[PDB]
Design a binder for this molecule. Structure first.
Ligand code: ADP
Ligand code: ADP
Ligand code: ADP
Ligand code: ADP
Lengths: 196, 487, 107, 478, 492
């Protein structure tokens, strides 16, 4: 009967890190091609099963403001590209959960943030250094078949995966513009028909 | 299993934390009112641990660490406990990470051997006897206290006792057996003198003669008892053997020498000596070479001791002592004649002498030396981390955790100096990586710098023993799975 | 971790933290694959420091080797760059926040 | 949210567990006391259709069971109990910290071995090779277990054997209709070829017609507008007067005033017949389904040969004999209670379906749990061979397969810890020809007993159970 | 103490399972040591890796636990090794029995299945007990390995070669009738674990001192009655004179070595020195037995009957000072069987630890010489037994097949427990070992120094057949005895 609502800075950081490790470490198990998918159930009348981290974080409802922030900007990133949302979420959760001990050591959060930015720059230059990228992937109809094995290797759709790979390469060829290299909303390759 | 491992970890870390801040020359002192009116006021870690209540087994093991480090070298008593606590806190993360304790223990053993060899190979050893550097280390240990002005009176005498007998014990290392110690109340600190052989400080009151060159020495622990059957026989045996100095032991009865027995023992005016501490009885026996026999019948011609001079001279004016030289095998424990009217100039002098003898023996057991002030700990925390990066396998993370937990000593040393601990310890780590081995903290001059200005210096063996014992005890604690009552 | 050897103080601790934080992705992948989360990552890390090859990852499909050049496991520079940069921006901005106040207090 | 979903699926499986085998316990379909007097059914498939389900994983399992039900044959009880056993074993293995992915991989590579073992022991029946009927007798009897219509089962099997040459082209199942009334016995089954709708003009309408082209109606100072609509309707009925049709589906309501005109025009007003009979007429006779009749004049009409209305056995037993195709074999029984309707309907539907896949796929294996023990032995042999933690996975798969007929044994009231163990030990030597019989309560060579199950439905059961178990096991949160 | 029809058996089996789980950890050469407390006032914080000592120090009241403890006592007394294995195997069998009873299976069927399951396991061991040439053509590596197996998780990893060499000399020329009095271990404190060498003497010198000659050839040795000395006064003087007449009667023998059990003060020592007699007081009973057998000094109360030629005979006796300690060697015995093992440790725990380890080592060497056949260690034998039992269970109909399968499961659980205490993934390792062992016959086994499977014979780490077979039999019979109890006044 003596509840208090004061939130000092360090305990506020502790609470925010707890919320982040709650929203993370929850969809962590979905990372990877054989990650444990999440069965999403609507609060009223719908149930679904999916493995994409962006989808599960988008459907899931979060109470804490930090979680809302992170999920809405993950939605923004999904809009930007649509890949690596799981990696982003799990990596941010990892950083926060292991920087909690730095906070316990007494380091000011500004110092941690600037050091993290410096480390990110180091990682960026290092990954740009060790890229063994191939540059012939323009007329690469046959290599394009094995490009998409990883993103389709999680299911048994491999029986006719080559057919849809050829469909995709034809689709990119018929809209292959060397000036803009973009696809718009009207050019959407989406239509769902039940049965078959 | 894990439910008891966590309890052991928590208990050991709690009992280590209660002495965490007492490390360093600027160590903060404690006051625990756990007892029945105990005014606890001191900054020595060992006494705080031994006076602290012990209920959990882990606390008992840590107190045993303190005692073993004290007996082995006599320094870094708090250091080993703090290191063990840091190791336990570090391995708590590994335990909750799913690593079975056997892997942690094996990795700690590998870390121990690597740290021992890195700490000794690139350290700064002493090659020649070099009593100057022993004196310098003593001064770094013997000054800044009440005995600081008495360093030039105490350290050189101990060094002379060392050079007098280079005992070939434990790899020609000067052990605790140079020349038997004595001490008498009264006098002044300037009255200290070095002896050669057995010396008696007990009260003697003989009006006749007690000074014969061929001082035959006997040990008849069988004294007078209240029933002539076994009373006057010892007098006849002494007369036949001709012993002149025979210390009396009251292990039979209090009436060791009655009036009639004294008068019968007054015809040759034999030396009468009482109240011998039991721990020194066997030392005296091996000094003279006679056996501790409490039977008069066993006392025979072979029981006669060897001596050259025995005088009840009033040394230093009013100090009655019996110096004996030329015995069978004297040299029980390094002599420092603690003379002084003041109370502090006795107890503090003895404590400082004990510290000096420990450190001198410490440097002669192994002739390597390192610079203190957190330099060895940061050096370990760097080199072992490098090893763990080079080391393969899943034990590499355990080795890295061991190295990281070895950073507490410089951090707490700097915190007790008032500096920002994190910033100064990591600055020291950077300076050590890009610089030299001797980088440490300057605790009592307000800053951080090399050791050449500081030159605190400590023997290698204190750190080696502390590290080894801490690792062995954390190994033992980790291998513990259950504790059962109801024997 | 190499860069933390020549670094100022709190950036040194921050980048040491960042290394272990980056190491989470391999443990997550291996744990989702069911194998030992820590053993496999440590082994592949030791192999990747022994060999200059940077494609020695974690084989979650239980195929032959840890080299994905044969397995065609490939990701673009832009995607990974955006992912790491956005994660860093997240940790920075969440560290910036130190208090949340809501009108309508109920003390 | 793994534990709660697993317990929910386990409870769903246990709820139907007791109904396995032709000795299963009965269940009560209760609800709020408004209309919950008493409903009982031995079959567990209909139990699931009336289960209030809350756990979404249980919802997925129930949906899979419904898929099995409306797919070929009846194996839903077996599929559900097998899935429950598999998830119970999965819970046990998770209790000993085994990752779900390894369990799923082991389950996949054990399911493939079980399926190939089932393929190995398949035996082709003679009804499609040398025209044996006893195999048809047994296959009809086994799927009609826990029932009572064994008296006129000969009529059922006659429609079974007569289907292969006339009633199906590639396994057609929509050409057979079932209808019955209240009041009768087991000696009521007979062959019919149409529904039981009688004429409504009266008694002066002739029983026989000339030719039937059957279609579907369209419809049934505002007084002037109503009179104009009436005139248009009379023009429409005059137009249908020259159509020359004799049968016509009247979907919408028609009162007497145009009803007598329909009768005088030779057009029978079939007052909103069930669309099942309309569909049967559509595929057998050739009467299409449309929305309006004004546009069809001479080419868009129906197609039929002969239709007559008769009364037999005090009821409106109209026999639509003489339609274009002789595949509309309709069984008309006479039940006694409401449950007879649905019970006979589902029993005949499932039996006819399994007969359709037998005449489509003639290979079969012996039932009675011998095939289950065979697959279990195969997967156990596989488990002893490969290393890794998936050995626990395949041995748990074998444990579930062994427990599948143990439920059958228990539901018969016999023992279960000996005859199942005896069957398992024998199956290494007393091979697939062995089996389990509830008639005597002992182990006997199942082939002489002759009770066998079609291979297709068994493989479907195994595949569906494995797939559902894997899907539910793959879920970990929410 | 009245109980119910299920509560008594449930609580007894749970108590037995708890006793098994108590020792479950300290299994294999990776045992998790445990602290034994007697809290009281100042209870010692002693810790041990050996579960047999734990059972010696376990205080339990449950009768099922009492039976398990008694069986473990007999286990330790007979062979001295494997006691932890027997206890954990019995606990696993009882846990499987509890699980089966939960499936309404009558215990009598379980016992009937288990009896012939044990028969099958034993005959499998006889079939696979490869008799190497260590006791046929005198191979030494097998002796090396069998000594190494029972010496695991100890502090004699350096001079273990000396212990194995003593085993070799035993199997060469101490194998008279299965010698067991040769197991003499005496040691002191202060030093290291590398202080192993040979001795055959008792570590007490002449109480007279250094004046009595060290080398005494003829030794007529027995046990005296009273302390020596030359109306209380009259009776004691007359008793002194009578006993002096007695010693003058017995002085004609010319004894040099003699043991006087009663305490000797100064005067009896002086009289002995005048008579050239040595005295040893309250000697170890094993030492007295060795003096009676190897030397010939029998135990007795008085010397009334031995007067002329009824004294023990010896070849040579000597007492010297070696190494600033009471190091006395009795060189010159009639037969050199009692090769005393003398050490110099650091702590007092070694005094009992090394002695019991060597008792077990000599026991298992006696087993090997009795039965030169042996089986590969490291969970190989257990896996082979489990495989045979599983085969028989698959072949056997009836309800006892389930009990036999549970027996095989409990057998397979032992290598799992061994691997768990090493930190390895026991489930994966044991599954791989079983899957191999189904086709990869007993030449394969578990390797512990690397946490991987291996070819067990190449590692050479083998254990004697006798101890393994009798472990199997004892565990089976203990489980059977505990199982047959259903409902008695048994616990509170
Ligand atoms: N065949 C594979 N081998 C190894 N790693 C893989 C494989 N397939 C996917 N991954 C890993 O799974 C992670 C998630 O990939 P992806 O599904 O494209 O992103 P998201 O999970 O955010 O949708 C990637 O970081 C990738 O490294
Ligand atoms: N004057 C000094 N300057 C820098 N460091 C010091 C100084 N004196 C002591 N130290 C460091 O502080 C530590 C104190 O050791 P400590 O555990 O307090 O010994 P004790 O427990 O016997 O008091 C030593 O390891 C030494 O390295
Ligand atoms: N008379 C019988 N003899 C032996 N086994 C039978 C008999 N009747 C049914 N079975 C077994 O019962 C199983 C199906 O039982 P149940 O689930 O009640 O029927 P359904 O599968 O149609 O729901 C089959 O696997 C079959 O082997
Ligand atoms: N090098 C080794 N590798 C594998 N297992 C070993 C090894 N050494 C000993 N063991 C195991 O130790 C067990 C015997 O130890 P144990 O009987 O517990 O000793 P004690 O009876 O003294 O408790 C054997 O079952 C054997 O499998």
């Amino acid at each position: 009967q003596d509840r208090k609502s004061r939130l000092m800075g360090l305990e506020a950081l502790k609470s925010h890190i707890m919320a982040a490790k709650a929203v993370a470490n929850t969809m962590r198990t979905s990372l990877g091609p054989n990650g444990l998918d999440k069965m999403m159930v609507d609060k009223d009348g719908d149930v679904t099963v999916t493995n994409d981290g962006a989808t599960i974080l988008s459907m899931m409802d979060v109470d804490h403001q930090i979680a809302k922030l992170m999920v809405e900007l993950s939605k923004s990133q999904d809009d930007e590209i649509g890949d690596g949302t799981t990696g982003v979420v799990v990596l941010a959760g990892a950083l926060l959960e292991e920087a909690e001990q730095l906070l316990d050591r007494g380091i000011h959060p500004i110092r941690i943030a600037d050091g993290y930015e410096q480390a990110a720059r180091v990682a960026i230059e290092h990954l740009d250094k060790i890229s063994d990228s191939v540059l012939v992937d323009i007329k690469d109809t046959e290599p394009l078949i094995q490009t998409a094995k990883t993103t389709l290797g999680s299911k048994v759709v491999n029986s006719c995966h080559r057919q849809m790979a050829e469909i995709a390469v034809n689709a990119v060829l018929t809209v292959a513009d060397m000036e803009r290299r973009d696809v718009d909303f009207e050019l959407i390759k989406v239509e769902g028909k039940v049965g078959g | 299993p894990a439910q008891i491992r966590f309890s052991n970890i928590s208990a050991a870390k709690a009992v280590a934390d209660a002495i965490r801040t007492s490390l360093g020359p600027k160590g903060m002192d404690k006051m625990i009112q756990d007892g029945k009116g105990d005014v606890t006021i001191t900054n020595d870690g060992a006494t705080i641990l031994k006076q602290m209540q012990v209920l959990h087994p882990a606390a008992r093991m840590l107190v045993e660490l303190s005692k073993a480090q004290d007996i082995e070298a006599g320094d870094g008593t708090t250091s080993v406990v703090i290191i063990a606590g840091s190791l336990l806190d570090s391995c708590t993360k590994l335990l909750q990470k799913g690593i079975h304790p056997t892997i942690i223990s094996e990795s700690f053993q590998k870390a121990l051997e690597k740290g021992i060899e890195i700490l000794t190979d690139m350290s700064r050893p002493v090659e020649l006897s070099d009593r100057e550097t022993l004196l310098n280390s003593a001064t770094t240990s013997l000054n800044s206290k009440v005995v600081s002005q008495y360093s030039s009176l105490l350290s050189p005498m101990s060094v002379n006792a060392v050079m007098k007998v280079i005992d070939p014990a434990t790899a020609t290392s000067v052990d605790l057996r140079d020349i038997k110690i004595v001490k008498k109340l009264g006098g002044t600190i300037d009255d200290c003198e070095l002896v050669e052989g057995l010396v008696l400080t007990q009260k003697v009151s003989n009006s006749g003669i007690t000074r014969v060159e061929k001082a035959k020495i006997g040990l008849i622990q069988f004294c007078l008892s209240a029933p002539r059957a076994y009373i006057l026989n010892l007098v006849k045996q002494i007369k036949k053997t001709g012993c002149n100095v025979l210390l009396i032991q009251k292990s039979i009865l209090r009436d060791a020498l009655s009036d009639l027995a004294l008068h019968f023992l007054n015809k040759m005016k034999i030396m009468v000596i009482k109240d011998i501490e039991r721990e020194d009885i066997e030392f005296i026996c091996k000094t003279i070479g006679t056996k501790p026999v409490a039977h008069i019948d066993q006392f025979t011609a072979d029981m006669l001791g060897s001596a050259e001079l025995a005088e009840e001279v009033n040394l230093n004016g009013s100090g009655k002592l019996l110096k004996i030289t030329g015995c069978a095998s004297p040299g029980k424990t390094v002599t420092i004649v603690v003379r002084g009217s003041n109370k502090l100039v006795i107890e503090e002098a003895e404590r400082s002498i004990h510290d000096a003898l420990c450190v001198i023996r410490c440097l002669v057991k192994k002739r390597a030396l390192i610079a203190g002030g957190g330099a060895p700990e940061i050096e370990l925390a760097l080199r072992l981390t490098e090893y763990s990066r080079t080391l393969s396998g899943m034990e590499s993370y355990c080795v890295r955790a061991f190295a990281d937990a070895m950073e507490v000593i410089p951090s707490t040393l700097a915190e007790n100096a008032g500096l920002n601990p994190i910033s100064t310890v990591t600055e020291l780590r950077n300076r050590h990586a890009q610089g030299e081995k001797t980088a440490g903290i300057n605790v009592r001059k307000g800053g951080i710098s090399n050791i050449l200005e500081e030159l605190v210096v400590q023997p290698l063996l204190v750190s080696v023993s502390a590290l080894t014992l801490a690792t062995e005890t954390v190994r033992s604690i980790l291998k513990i799975d259950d504790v059962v009552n109801t024997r | 971790s190499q860069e933390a050897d020549k670094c100022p103080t709190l950036e040194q601790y921050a980048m040491r933290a960042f290394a272990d934080a980056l190491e989470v992705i391999p443990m997550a992948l291996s744990e989702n694959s069911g194998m030992n989360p820590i053993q496999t990552m440590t082994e592949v890390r030791a192999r990747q420091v022994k060999e200059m090859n940077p494609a020695l990852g974690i084989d979650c499909l239980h195929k032959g080797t840890n080299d994905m050049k044969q397995q065609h496991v490939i990701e673009t520079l832009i995607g990974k760059k955006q992912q790491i940069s956005l994660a860093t921006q997240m940790v920075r901005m969440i560290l910036k926040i130190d208090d949340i106040r809501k009108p309508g207090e109920s003390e | 949210a793994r534990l709660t979903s697993f317990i929910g699926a386990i409870a769903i499986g246990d709820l139907v567990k007791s109904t396995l085998g032709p000795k299963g316990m009965d269940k009560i379909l209760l609800s709020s006391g408004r209309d919950a007097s008493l409903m009982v059914t031995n079959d567990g498939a209909t139990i699931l259709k009336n289960i209030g389900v809350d756990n979404p994983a249980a919802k997925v399992l129930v949906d899979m069971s419904r898929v099995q039900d409306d797919e070929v044959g009846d194996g839903t009880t077996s599929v559900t109990v097998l899935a429950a056993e598999l998830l119970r074993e999965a819970e046990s293995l998770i209790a000993k910290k085994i990752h779900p992915q390894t369990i799923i991989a082991g389950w996949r590579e054990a399911t493939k071995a079980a399926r190939e073992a089932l393929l190995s022991s398949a035996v082709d029946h003679g009804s499609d090779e040398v025209k044996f009927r006893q195999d048809l007798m047994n296959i009809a009897g086994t799927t009609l277990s826990s029932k009572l219509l064994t008296h006129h089962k000969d009529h059922f099997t006659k429609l079974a054997v007569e289907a292969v040459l006339r009633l199906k082209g590639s396994g057609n199942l929509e050409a057979i209709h079932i209808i019955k009334k209240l009041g009768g016995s087991l000696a009521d089954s007979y062959l019919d070829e149409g529904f039981l709708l009688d004429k409504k003009i009266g008694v002066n309408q002739p029983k026989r017609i000339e030719n039937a082209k059957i279609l579907i109606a369209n419809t049934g100072k505002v007084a002037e507008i109503e009179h104009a609509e009436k005139e248009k309707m009379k023009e429409k009925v005059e137009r249908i007067l020259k159509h020359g049709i004799n049968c016509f589906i009247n979907r919408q309501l028609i009162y007497n005033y145009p009803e007598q005109l329909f009768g005088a025009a030779g057009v029978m007003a079939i007052e909103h017949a069930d669309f099942a009979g309309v569909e049967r007429l559509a595929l057998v006779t050739g009467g299409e389904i449309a929305s309006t009749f004004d546009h069809p004049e001479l080419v868009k009409l129906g197609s039929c040969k002969l239709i007559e209305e008769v009364m037999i056995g005090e009821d409106k037993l109209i026999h639509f004999s003489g339609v274009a195709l002789g595949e509309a074999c309709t069984i008309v029984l006479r039940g006694a209670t409401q449950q007879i309707l649905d019970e006979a309907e589902r029993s005949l539907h499932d039996a006819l379906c399994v007969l359709a896949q037998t005449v489509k796929d003639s290979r079969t294996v012996y039932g009675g749990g011998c095939s289950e023990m065979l697959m279990a032995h195969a997967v156990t042999q596989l488990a002893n061979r490969t290393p890794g933690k998936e050995a626990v996975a395949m041995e748990s798969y074998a444990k579930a397969l062994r427990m599948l007929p143990t439920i059958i044994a228990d539901n018969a009231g016999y023992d279960s810890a000996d005859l199942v163990a005896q069957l398992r030990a024998a199956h290494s030597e007393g091979n697939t020809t062995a089996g389990l019989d509830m008639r005597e309560g002992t182990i006997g060579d199942m082939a002489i007993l002759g009770i066998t199950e079609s291979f297709q439905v068994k493989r479907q059961v195994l595949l569906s159970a494995a797939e559902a178990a894997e899907v539910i096991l793959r879920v970990d949160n929410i």
